[PDB]
């Protein structure tokens, strides 16, 4: 657990590819070179091991000994660190780069007094980890690169002349990921350096001095994230990939060998949904149901997604202008909930585990309960062995799945390879802990992906974490596992650019409270800030995905300027009303039909819905989802307030009629607004006026101007129904 490492398992990477080779009193000259090559990473010393490279330790001309001597006078004037010309048969060190990864160090009695020589020495060794190894995982990349650039523009003009070569300098702009393709014999060239300076002791502290956060990269990548490397080399090694498979498969070679050809076909059909038979849902259609279904155009519906629609299609034809109808609707409304292949992964993740949620039938929703708990029961071997220590579980991923949104930038338009940079850092934003309420279906290997594919995971798991083998190299896992960001960064692969995340699983607890303890303190404020029982409960947090960690972050800003645009009046009157009906602000991530909130009130379920954000007058609750893109509305908080203007039209008709109860845009004055220019704002306002009033509302409250004198411009009479209600709700 500490002395148990370094050196007594380094005696061992000594043995093995340290080879010496010297004259004469065969001792201290081995101590200096041990002792040299000690202040070194260990990990970087196996890595040489794994791309197969030996070293030497000579006396005299290093080359003149038989690894050395091919290379002809093509390759004979060496460059040293300072950028001087010590030349080969006059040098003390080299590091032959080839297929055959040699290197070579001349002995010495002790590098103690000396300092600038084991400089030199550690600086070839890192021309060797920034050009024979690093190079074959693609590294140094993007995270290296902004340490480059922050040198290059800074205050002092001097950390640079430390390690910049005599042209990294001078180029004109900050240096592209394109440039450590045309230039990279230079950006080695330079992490180089800063390995040397930051192994050389008494060089340290000058590279503490002159190089900024040049410092701090080998700090954090020489003391914790270097393994991270170790390992992926090591994924790319066959024996080896293989080696781990077989050792993972073995821990579980009798889990599986004991499995009912109904708990097999139980975990397939997990694996792939299935789609219902047309059959099937002709005779089960009924009298009046399936005659109706013969006059339906189809697409005439708004709903109804195409892949769907495409499908009821076929019925018409297996049975044998724009207004539609309602009480069709409500027949093409119910078949949408026959229509749904049935997915027990895709169940769980829409529900976030509440699996008893009154979201779906009932003849189905019991059958994914039997199922599942069936499924968490075949899952009782943890992976936890004594085969091996931490398990790298790898996992491939569409950025969708946790915000569409930022999907719709995250790549970039001209050259889908690359991933525009911006969009990147408001993802790695507030990303922190992750969980995952379905069965996650990991590879053991990495293996490559898919397109909407971009997102790389590489989950360290609980010796605990319960997991099952699977025959073709993956792992499925428990359901409502803690996991938790340990460090994003971007990452070039297969003539490719992915996002790799590094996630260490945890209790769910770990992460299930740090949410309540956050939920807490959200409200523990935003109560003060609006004159409220500090003891209430106005937000709320109903969490259980892969993003977790920002659906709560974001609820913070999207209050946080849902204030800094609305007279702190109108918003406390209001709010009141809400916080009067056990209203709520749910921040969530679990499809909308599955919130409390919008189906205690449903009369039949095929009337719930779904979508970016909702109201709901009975409960007074604001919806919000949080994985997805209302009709290109840039930001969540927007969203948010359109529903706010629902609240709004709420409590003026309320102070209407105190009791009868009606939305202010039921009003014979607001239709004859509605009418005229009621359908001059967005495409989604030419709805109905409740809908209007709550578009037309939103940007008359937008954070852009420019979206508020429009509704003035083409919505004038408008603009001053809404801003009446205000002044009016304002007084109340
Ligand atoms: C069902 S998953 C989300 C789908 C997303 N949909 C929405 O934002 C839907 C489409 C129609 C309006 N949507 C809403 O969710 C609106 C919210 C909204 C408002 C304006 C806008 O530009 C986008 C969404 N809900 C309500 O008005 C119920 S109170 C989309 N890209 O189609
Ligand atoms: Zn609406």
């Avoid at 001087?84 to 007094?113: F, M, N, R, T």
């Avoid at 502290?205 to 080399?233: R, T």
């Avoid at 209302?630 to 009791?659: C, P, Q, T, W």
Wanted: proline share 3%; aromatic share 10%.
């Amino acid at each position: 657990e500490r002395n148990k490492t370094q050196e007594e398992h380094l005696k061992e990477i000594m043995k093995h590819i340290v080879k010496i080779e010297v004259k004469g009193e065969e001792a201290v000259k081995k101590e200096a070179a041990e002792k040299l090559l000690e202040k070194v990473p260990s990990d970087v010393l196996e890595m040489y091991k794994a791309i197969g490279g030996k070293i030497y330790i000579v006396d005299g001309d290093i080359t003149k000994h038989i690894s050395l001597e091919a290379l002809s006078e093509d390759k004979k004037k060496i460059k040293d660190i300072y950028g001087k010309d010590a030349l080969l048969h006059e040098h003390y060190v080299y590091a032959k780069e080839g297929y055959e990864p040699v290197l070579v160090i001349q002995s010495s009695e002790d590098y103690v007094e000396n300092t600038e020589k084991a400089l030199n020495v550690y600086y070839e060794i890192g021309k060797i980890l920034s050009r024979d190894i690093l190079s074959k995982i693609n590294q140094p990349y993007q995270k290296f690169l902004d340490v480059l650039n922050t040198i290059k523009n800074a205050s002092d003009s001097d950390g640079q002349d430390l390690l910049f070569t005599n042209q990294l300098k001078e180029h004109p702009t900050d240096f592209s990921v394109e440039f450590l393709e045309q230039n990279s014999n230079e950006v080695q060239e330079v992490f180089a350096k800063a390995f040397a300076y930051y192994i050389e002791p008494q060089h340290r502290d000058v590279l503490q001095l002159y190089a900024p956060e040049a410092f701090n990269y080998m700090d954090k990548f020489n003391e914790q994230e270097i393994n991270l490397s170790l390992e992926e080399l090591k994924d790319q090694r066959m024996l080896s990939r293989y080696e781990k498979w077989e050792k993972i498969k073995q821990h579980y070679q009798h889990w599986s060998d004991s499995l009912s050809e109904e708990g097999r076909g139980l975990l397939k059909k997990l694996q792939i949904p299935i789609e219902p038979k047309k059959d099937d849902i002709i005779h089960s259609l009924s009298q009046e149901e399936k005659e109706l279904l013969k006059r339906i155009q189809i697409d005439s519906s708004d709903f109804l997604s195409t892949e769907e629609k495409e499908f009821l299609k076929k019925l018409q034809i297996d049975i044998r202008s724009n207004p539609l109808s309602e009480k069709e609707k409500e027949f093409l409304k119910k078949l949408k909930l026959d229509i749904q292949p049935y997915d027990i992964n895709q169940r769980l993740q829409d529900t976030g585990g509440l699996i008893d949620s009154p979201s779906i039938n009932l003849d189905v929703r019991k059958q994914y309960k039997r199922d599942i708990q069936n499924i968490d029961a075949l899952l009782h071997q943890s992976i936890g062995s004594t085969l091996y220590n931490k398990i790298y579980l790898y996992e491939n991923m569409n950025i969708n799945n946790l915000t569409a949104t930022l999907g719709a930038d995250l790549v970039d338009s001209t050259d889908n390879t690359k991933i525009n940079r911006g969009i990147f850092n408001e993802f790695k934003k507030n990303f922190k802990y992750s969980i995952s309420s379905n069965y996650m279906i990991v590879d053991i290997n990495e293996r490559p992906a898919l397109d909407n594919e971009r997102l790389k995971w590489r989950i360290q798991l609980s010796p605990d974490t319960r997991a099952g083998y699977l025959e073709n190299g993956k792992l499925i896992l428990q359901r409502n596992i803690g996991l938790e960001i340990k460090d994003v960064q971007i990452i070039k692969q297969s003539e490719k650019e992915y996002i790799r995340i590094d996630a260490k699983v945890v209790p769910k607890s770990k992460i299930d409270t740090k949410i309540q303890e956050a939920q807490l303190n959200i409200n523990q404020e935003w109560n003060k800030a609006l004159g409220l029982p500090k003891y209430t409960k106005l937000i709320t947090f109903n969490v259980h995905n892969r993003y977790a960690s920002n659906i709560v972050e974001s609820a913070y800003l999207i209050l946080n300027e849902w204030k800094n645009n609305i007279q702190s009046d109108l918003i406390k009157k209001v709010t009141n009303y809400l916080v009067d009906g056990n209203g709520r602000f749910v921040f969530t991530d679990i499809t909308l039909p599955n919130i409390a909130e919008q189906y205690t009130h449903q009369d039949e379920i095929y009337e719930q819905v779904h979508s970016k954000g909702l109201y709901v007058p009975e409960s007074r609750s604001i919806l919000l989802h949080g994985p997805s893109k209302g009709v290109e509305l840039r930001n969540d908080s927007e969203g948010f307030i359109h529903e706010f203007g629902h609240a709004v039209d709420d409590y003026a008709g309320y102070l209407l009629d105190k009791n009868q109860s009606d939305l202010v845009t039921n009003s014979k004055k607001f239709i004859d607004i509605f009418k005229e220019e009621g359908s001059n704002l967005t495409s989604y306002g030419r709805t109905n006026e409740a809908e209007f009033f709550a578009e037309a509302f939103r940007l008359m409250h937008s954070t852009d101007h420019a979206e508020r004198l429009k509704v003035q411009k083409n919505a004038p009479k408008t603009f001053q129904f809404i801003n009446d209600q205000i002044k009016f709700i304002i007084n109340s």
